Amino acid sequence: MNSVMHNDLKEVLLTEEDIQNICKELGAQLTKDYQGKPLVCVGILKGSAMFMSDLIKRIDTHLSIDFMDVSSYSTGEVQIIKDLGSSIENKDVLIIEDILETGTTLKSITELLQSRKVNSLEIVTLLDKPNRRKADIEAKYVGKKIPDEFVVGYGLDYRELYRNLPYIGTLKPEVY
Numbered sequence: 665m666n667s668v669m670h671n672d673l674k675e676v677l678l679t680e681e682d683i684q685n686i687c688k689e690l691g692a693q694l695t696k697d698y699q700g701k702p703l704v705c706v707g708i709l710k711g712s713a714m715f716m717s718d719l720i721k722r723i724d725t726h727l728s729i730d731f732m733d734v735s736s737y738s739t740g741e742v743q744i745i746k747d748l749g750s751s752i753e754n755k756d757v758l759i760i761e762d763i764l765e766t767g768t769t770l771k772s773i774t775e776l777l778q779s780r781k782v783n784s785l786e787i788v789t790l791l792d793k794p795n796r797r798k799a800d801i802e803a804k805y806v807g808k809k810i811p812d813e814f815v816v817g818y819g820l821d822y823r824e825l826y827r828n829l830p831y832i833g834t835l836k837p838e839v840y
């Protein structure tokens with residue numbers, strides 16, 4: 665562990681500027697697609713909150729937000745630790761993820777929300793590791809497909825640390 669935190673990184677994969685550019689570009693597209701619709705943006709705690717927060721700045725249409733907290737009992741079966749606080753019937757739902765990996769938990773969440781009689785349901789993920797997929801799920805909106813290496817920053821943690829970086833990258837191997 666370095667006193668200076670950026671010194672913990674081996675490589676920066678996405679700078680803050682890169683991430684903000686992705687938010688602007690995805691936000692413009694999402695604005696197009698959801699303008700005038702009853703859009704609810706749903707984040708899955710904890711890490712997705714950083715990306716969501718920046719993404720919704722750039723969605724220039726009315727929307728509400730909500731959050732869920734879920735735990736795997738990956739077996740497809742998911743435990744709801746915090747459910748949505750508001751109804752999604754007749755709403756257009758966008759689940760906002762920091763990273764899509766196996767998809768298993770996310771697939772189960774989409775099945776649940778679909779049962780609530782939404783108008784539509786789509787996923788926007790900042791990062792995608794498609795090689796990791798185990799469930800039959802793909803995001804309509806993807807920021808960047810990345811190598812299957814452990815990354816941290818911008819919501820993504822190691823041992824609960826590093827979610828505060830405004831960029832994303834790989835750690836030196838002496839850190840883990």
Ligand SMILES: [Cl-]
Nearest residue numbers: 714715717718
């Ligand atoms: Cl943020």
Ligand SMILES: [Cl-]
Nearest residue numbers: 702703727728
């Ligand atoms: Cl709404």
Ligand SMILES: [Cl-]
Nearest residue numbers: 813814815816
């Ligand atoms: Cl990772």
Ligand code: NA
Nearest residue numbers: 714715717718
């Ligand atoms: Na933010």
